[PDB]
Each structure stands twice: as structure tokens, then as C-alpha cells.
């Protein structure tokens, strides 16, 4: 991010916690108390469900 | 590996081959940001020039 006047290095891990996480934590899912996920699938007009 | 194991069954297969290109040499330019900042160079200007 910058080099201080004292010749030091200001990395990103020194001012921020970096990790992998969902783009949004709004939605969560559980299957019988068990952590899970899934897809909700709809139909396009005119198609057959089967 | 699959092409190798396929050349071992010439009684059923032949002329087996890929339909693509094989890897070629590539020139990698590793930039260092410490010096680019020390000398006061904008990585944006660097890559735009390049």
C-alpha cells in the first residue's frame, strides 16, 4: 500500500484480514439441523416440468 | 496418457490426435512494486506503456 519514510513496507495483511467468504451472508440453509446448501429451480414459460 | 493408451489399441482406433495447439514459449515480465514506488512510477503508466 505504501513505503513509509523509514524504509518499511506496509503490506495489506498488516491492516486487513483476508479470507474466502460468501459474496453475501444474507441467505443460509439447513437440512434437518444439518449444514447444507442448494438450488431452487423454476420453470421458463412454455416448458414442461417433467 | 489417454493418447498413449489409445495408440496401444490400433485394432480399433487410428490417427488419434488432439485438435489443439501445444504449449509454446512465453516471455514473463515480473514487475516489483517496491522500486516502482520508490522511483515514483505508476504501475498503471507502466502497464499502459508496455
Swiss-Prot record, chain A:
AcrA-AcrB-AcrZ-TolC is a drug efflux protein complex with broad substrate specificity that uses the proton motive force to export substrates. (Microbial infection) Involved in contact-dependent growth inhibition (CDI), acts downstream of BamA, the receptor for CDI. Its role in CDI is independent of the AcrA-AcrB-TolC efflux pump complex. The chain holds residues 251 to 300 of 1049 of the full protein. Induction: Positively regulated by MarA, Rob and SoxS transcriptional regulators (at protein level). Homotrimer, with large domains that extend into the periplasm, interacts with AcrA and TolC. AcrA may be required to stably link this protein and TolC. Interacts with AcrZ. Part of the AcrA-AcrB-AcrZ-TolC efflux pump. It is found in: Cell inner membrane. It comes from the Bacteria. This is Multidrug efflux pump subunit AcrB. Disruption phenotype: Loss of susceptibility to contact-dependent growth inhibition (CDI); inhibiting cells still contact the target. Belongs to the resistance-nodulation-cell division (RND) (TC 2.A.6) family.
